[PDB]
Paper text:
Tripartite systems of the Resistance Nodulation cell Division (RND) superfamily are composed of an inner-membrane RND transporter driven by the proton motive force, an outer-membrane factor (OMF), and a periplasmic membrane fusion protein (MFP), forming a tripartite pump with a contiguous exit duct. Among the major RND actors in drug resistance in Pseudomonas aeruginosa, MexB transporter works in conjunction with OprM (OMF component), and MexA (MFP component). Archetypical RND transporters operate as a secondary proton/drug antiporter exploiting the energy associated to proton transport in their transmembrane domains to power the export of substrates through the periplasmic pore domain, 60 Å away, via long-range conformational communication. Crystal structure determination revealed that MexB as well as the E coli homologous AcrB are asymmetric homotrimers for which the three monomer conformations representing consecutive states were designated Loose (or Access), Tight (or Binding), and Open (or Extrusion).
Secondly, isolated MexB particles (MexB-solo) were processed independently of the tripartite complex. The resulting reconstruction yielded a density map at ~4.6 Å resolution revealing an asymmetric conformation of MexB-solo different from that of MexB-trio. Structural deviation (rmsd 1.43 Å) of the related protomer T mostly concerned the peripheral of the domain PN2, so that the internal features of the drug pathway, including the deep binding pocket, remained the same. By contrast, in the third protomer of MexB-solo which is expected to be involved in drug release as observed in the O protomer of MexB-trio, the most striking change (rmsd 1.43 Ǻ) concerned the central helix plus helix gate (amino acids 99–124). Overall, MexB-solo adopted a LTC conformation while MexB-trio is in the LTO conformation, and structural comparisons revealed differences mainly in PN2 subdomain of protomer T, and in PC2, PN1 subdomains and the central helix plus helix gate of protomer C/O. Before being assembled in the complex, the LTC conformation of MexB-solo prevents drug export. Indeed, proton transport of MexB-solo was weak in the presence or in the absence of substrate suggesting that substrate binding is not sufficient to elicit a closed to open conformational change.
Author numbering:
A (entry chain L): 302 to 1030
B (entry chain L): 1 to 201
C (entry chain K): 102 to 251
D (entry chain J): 52 to 101
E (entry chain K): 302 to 351
F (entry chain K): 1 to 51
């Protein structure tokens, strides 16, 4: 609809006169267009180098593409099932698929490992080796899907306000896995293993051509180093778990130490700036400051803003002559480089400039990432009155609450959106002496309403259009209170009497913005906690101040804090059913209890690194990180399970109980070191990124590598000792 | 049965080709945005009332209309307010995951219980029921540098020409035009009215 | 969904009604057959009639028990407070007045006034003050209704 | 009434108060001299009439 | 919905004056709880004999 | 069919366990009542014309 109203209604431009044109002072098309055009480029940079890194791995220059032709095809099945489920594409499914694209290649890795294990040590043709491959890969490939899907399948059942954001990180991601296992059963191991695989007696690794012949012997040295390191770690086996329990104690300590946030903001190229004046000020008294801030923004900050567009008469904090707001459009994303061109530096510089203004309470702010709810970040507090008590006592309650506002240590910069008591003029009439002079009352009401209420009489036609005709006096006879004495009304016998002979007036006070809530009147303030602190302690720190009020009134929570009071982050209820479903489901492969219970204990090893990776980066917890933990523990679990089943199936074949584990590490060390770096070498342009949508990309980039660096080089030292435990009888 | 993929290679090609075609046909028909529906429905109702205080607009035309705003499914709360230029919003929010058409028509049929209860001046202005959620999308409309055109005729050409083929397209829910259209303003003089022995009425 | 022919049936006869009928509203409800429960009682202190409790019920717990989930209808016993006036024919004949004159005097005196503002737009250039003006406010007590010039 | 007296005062004030509605194809409004008025509006193909 | 009604009654009733009270003279909700309790009491007392 | 599950007893157990856990989800994620919607829908109108 944006592209269907931005030029299809511009077809009236030939019908438009030459004295008018069209500009775009406010827009939102780049954050929806350039975001998609950037995420398709980062998908290209994702599957651009994953061909060349495995080309470095398997040393094949022509028979190389065969695990990477299915990969640009299976992502279309995600869009197919996404159209079948009827959910629109967003930043969410793109941010899911940019990490899902690297975890769906692992079956293509394991089938070319099944090819290479009969290509290296065996001279068998791939036609006779396809049956040997599928005899051992069908019992190992169909089991990972039910343990990988069960991290999102219980996560999809949770709804609420924070459930539609759990969707598109739900089953829409792992539907690509559920179709990739099907195309792994039906597509790769019959043709990609056989037809593009000649026999040249492959035992090379000495010359390799050009700048390539010094990798395979170093890889053999690293495999022998791992084989002697596991023999070194099986010596004592007591301090290697005594240092495991201390990092289990460190996980809960880091989890308590880190605070959380909720949906962090971006730059978006837009800024809002509202104005404020003391009451009674006219529209010119607000016009005297918007031109000054316009000249300031156009001259002193010319390296950041493209255009400004202010209005007056209307604001987010009410309306009238005491109001006004300004939209600010900055440079495009290729035109404002550097961190000083961000919205936060511009916001704090604007506030530092607005500190110099004396009689105006100008406030600038930036909208959050989500636009369809909330103008800014924070919380509100409605103040209901149950007994229906008057306006002045609840105004004094608001005054006492705003006095006990800046003293709270858990909150900062909490402000009202209303106003103070405006000095109004209350008129009074002496209808007894007015009737003694011989005037009525309804004619007096009619005259004062036509004189100052700016009445509307009927319709009239102009240029084929129906418009309205009003009726009012003149402005220069109504700007002053004694000018209100300049009016005359007709009595019963034709003559006129002035206004001051019967009617007078005085000066009282009254609020200009009266707000009701659930039938009763209610005022409110809005704020935010300290930078970094959550909203739970900020909620708990204000429910103790509500004992300091005139008793008879109560409090209420609404807005985006309403769902936070109802059901926010359900991390107690989360990570429990999802843990139990994989703990019951992973025993379907090994048909035991002690071995699945032992290999389940790798899930603490991967979660710890993503906690302190955020502290090393400098970011707080979010729902993006809350699904980043799920995908990295899924990656750690699937990187742990595919090596223990080989040891279990080869213990009963020809080996012992302690030797089969190190034999499985001796025979299957290649793909576990392959696919982990093959995944994370594409996430680096998303791990470090500055531009359109850089904050939400950073909200997932710094967690996924930290969760796996403690999972592919570290957890391989701990998984076989977990397998060969003495309780595993 | 199983193990039916070794013998027929291009039968294993065409099963990938048909899901590639099914994914290729899905891009041109699926709509593109950046964020789905997160906010609950936020059905707004606003009126205008010329030349009255906030206390008058609170004790006249919101107290008689918030007593009939009831009997509605999935009602969360009623965020209402009033201003000094005779404006008010009684925006009712609903539960998450609800089609807003019944939320429109229920508020409409409950607003029918108040339209004769309103005074005669505010009924000739026009009640407004909108499905606006929280925010705007774009603003347009500006004067050229040729001069001889103020803000008034600019607002009149915005209202009388542009928004009439614009407000009936897809995605349009609310319009917030800055400045009003043309009107016939008749300004009176109290000294001349006293001289000619006439009231304004 | 099934209210569609109900919501257009009202338009054929909404302004065709008499105006005193139209000043109450045609309440369209989804009441089906029965009730659920009843509440409301006097305490042991007494000092309450059979009208003030109904007035308190409809004034305090009407909207928090009707804006909730599932509530479709209510049929309260008693109603709110009302500023009732009981005319007498003897004193009316003594003062030679019709009750229509009394109703027009009430509907002329107890009127809210849309006055406006002192610094209203388009104001004169250089005006540095704006304030709303409050005219005749609605009456509050019974003696305020007593002090009405008939 | 006449055709102009039904064209200026009723259709031209209802057609301005009939916006913000979903799936509007077009509004073909017409009037005659004997006091008739039609605001027949078409919707998208395959929607719901009620 | 009945316990929601009793919650939104019990929350604000301290703000009512002390010369007032609230009872439930007619109610249909407790027979549902009594019925479902007496028929889940005929499940543990029904499967042990089988 | 059978005979793939007497030799795999824990794979025979896991289906009953996931059925029991889905039941433990559905016992709390379901509303209970006394009787279903037997009555037909009905729409009413009400006025009050005193005197």
């Amino acid at each position: 609809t944006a592209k269907a109203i931005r030029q299809t209604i511009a077809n009236l431009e030939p019908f438009m006169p030459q004295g008018m044109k069209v500009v775009y002072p406010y827009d939102t098309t780049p954050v929806v267009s350039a975001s998609i055009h950037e995420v398709v480029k980062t998908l290209g940079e994702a599957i651009l180098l994953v061909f060349l890194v495995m080309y470095l791995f398997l040393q094949n220059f022509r028979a190389t593409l065969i695990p990477t032709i299915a990969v640009p095809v299976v992502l279309l099945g995600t869009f197919g099932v996404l159209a079948a489920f009827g959910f629109s594409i967003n930043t969410l499914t793109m941010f899911g698929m940019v990490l899902a694209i690297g975890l769906l290649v692992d079956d293509a890795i394991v089938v070319v490992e099944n090819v290479e294990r009969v290509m290296a040590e065996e001279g068998l043709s791939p036609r006779e080796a396809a049956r040997k491959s599928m005899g051992q890969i069908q019992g190992a490939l169909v089991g990972i899907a039910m343990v990988l899907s069960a991290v999102f399948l219980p996560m999809a059942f949770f709804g609420g306000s924070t459930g539609v954001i759990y969707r598109q990180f739900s089953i829409t991601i792992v539907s690509a896995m559920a179709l990739s296992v099907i195309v792994a059963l039906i597509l790769t191991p019959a043709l990609c293993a056989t037809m593009l695989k000649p026999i040249e007696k492959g035992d090379h690794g000495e010359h390799k051509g050009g700048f390539f012949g010094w990798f395979n012997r170093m890889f053999l040295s690293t495999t022998h180093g791992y084989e002697r390191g596991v023999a070194s770690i099986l010596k004592h086996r007591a301090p290697y778990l005594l240092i495991y329990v201390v990092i289990v104690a460190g996980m809960i300590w880091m989890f308590t130490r880190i605070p959380t946030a909720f949906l962090p903001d971006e730059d978006q190229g837009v800024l809002f700036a509202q104005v404020q004046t003391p009451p009674g000020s006219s529209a010119e008294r607000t016009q005297v400051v918007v031109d000054s801030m316009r000249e300031y923004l156009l001259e002193k900050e010319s390296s950041s803003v493209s255009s400004v567009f202010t209005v007056t008469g209307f604001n987010f904090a009410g309306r009238g002559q005491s109001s006004g707001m300004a939209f600010i459009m900055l440079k495009p994303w290729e035109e404002r480089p550097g961190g000083e061109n961000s919205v936060f530096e511009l916001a704090k510089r604007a506030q530092m400039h607005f500190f110099s203004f004396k009689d105006a309470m100008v406030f600038a702010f930036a909208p959050p990432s989500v636009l369809e709810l909330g103008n800014a970040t924070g919380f509100d507090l409605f103040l209901q009155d149950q007994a229906g008590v008057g306006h002045e006592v609840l105004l004094q309650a608001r005054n006492k609450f705003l006095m006990l506002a800046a003293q709270n240590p858990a909150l900062q910069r909490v402000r009202p959106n209303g106003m103070s008591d405006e000095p109004q003029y209350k008129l009074e009439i002496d209808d007894e002496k007015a009737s003694a002079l011989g005037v009525s009352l309804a004619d007096i009401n009619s005259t004062v309403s036509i004189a100052w209420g700016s009445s509307y009489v009927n319709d009239f036609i102009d240029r084929g259009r129906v418009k309205r005709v009003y009726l009012q006096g003149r402005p220069d006879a109504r700007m002053n209170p004694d000018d209100l004495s300049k009016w005359y009304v007709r009595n019963d016998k034709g003559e006129m009497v002035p206004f001051n002979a019967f009617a007078t007036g005085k000066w009282e006070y009254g609020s200009p913005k009266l707000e009701r809530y659930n039938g009763v009147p209610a005022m409110e303030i809005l704020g935010e906690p300290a930078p970094g602190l959550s909203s739970g302690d900020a909620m708990a720190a204000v429910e103790e101040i509500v004992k300091q009020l005139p008793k008879g009134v109560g409090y209420s929570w609404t807005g985006l804090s309403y769902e936070e009071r109802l059901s926010g982050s359900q991390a107690p209820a989360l990570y429990a059913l999802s843990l139990l479903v994989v703990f019951l489901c992973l025993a379907a492969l090994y048909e035991s209890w002690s071995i699945p219970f032992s290999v389940m204990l790798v899930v603490p090893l991967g979660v710890i690194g993503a906690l302190l990776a955020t502290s090393m980066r400098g970011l707080s917890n979010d729902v993006f990180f809350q699904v980043g933990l799920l995908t990295t523990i899924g990656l750690s679990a699937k990187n742990a399970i595919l090596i223990v089943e080989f040891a279990k199936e080869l213990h009963e074949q020809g080996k012992g109980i302690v030797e089969a584990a190190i034999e499985a590490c001796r025979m299957r060390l290649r793909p576990i070191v392959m696919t982990s770096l093959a995944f994370i070498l594409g996430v680096v342009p998303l791990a470090i990124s500055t531009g359109a949508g850089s904050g939400s990309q950073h909200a997932i980039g710094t967690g996924v590598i930290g969760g796996m660096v403690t999972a592919t080089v570290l957890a391989i030292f701990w998984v076989p000792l977990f397998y060969v435990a003495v309780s595993t009888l | 049965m199983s193990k039916f993929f070794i013998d027929r290679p291009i039968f294993a090609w065409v099963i990938a080709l048909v899901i590639m075609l099914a994914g290729g046909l899905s891009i041109l028909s699926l709509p593109v945005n950046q964020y789905p529906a997160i906010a609950p429905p936020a059905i707004a109702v606003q009126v205008s009332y010329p030349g009255a205080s906030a206390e008058t607009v609170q004790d006249t035309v919101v107290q008689v209309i918030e007593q009939q705003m009831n009997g509605i499914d999935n009602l969360r709360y009623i965020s209402s307010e009033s201003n000094s230029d005779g404006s008010m919003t009684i925006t009712v929010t609903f539960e998450q995951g609800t089609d807003p058409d019944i939320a429109q028509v229920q508020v409409q049929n409950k607003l029918q219980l108040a339209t004769p209860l309103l005074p005669q001046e505010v009924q000739r202005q026009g009640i407004r029921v909108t499905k606006a959620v929280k925010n705007f999308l774009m603003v347009v409309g500006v004067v050229s540098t040729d001069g001889s055109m103020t803000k008034e005729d600019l607002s009149n050409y915005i209202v009388s020409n542009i928004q009439d083929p614009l407000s009936r397209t897809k995605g349009v829910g609310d319009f917030q035009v800055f400045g009003s259209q043309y009107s016939m303003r008749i300004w009176l003089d109290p000294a001349k009215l006293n001289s000619y022995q006439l009231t304004p009425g | 969904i099934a209210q569609v022919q109900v919501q257009n049936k009202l338009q054929l006869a909404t302004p065709l009604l008499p105006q005193e009928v139209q000043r109450q509203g045609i309440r369209v409800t989804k009441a089906v057959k029965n009730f659920l429960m009843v509440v409301g009682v006097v305490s042991t202190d007494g000092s309450m009639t059979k009208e003030d409790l109904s007035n308190y019920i409809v004034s305090n717990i009407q909207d928090p028990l009707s804006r909730t989930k599932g509530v479709g209808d209510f049929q309260v016993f008693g109603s709110q407070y009302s500023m009732r006036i009981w005319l007498d024919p003897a004193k009316l004949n003594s003062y030679q007045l019709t009750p229509g004159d009394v109703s027009s005097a009430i509907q002329a005196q107890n009127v809210q006034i849309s006055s406006g503002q002192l610094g209203g737009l388009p104001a004169v250039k250089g005006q540095q003050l704006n304030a709303t003006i409050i005219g005749k406010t609605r009456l509050q007590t019974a003696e305020q209704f007593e002090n009405i010039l008939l």
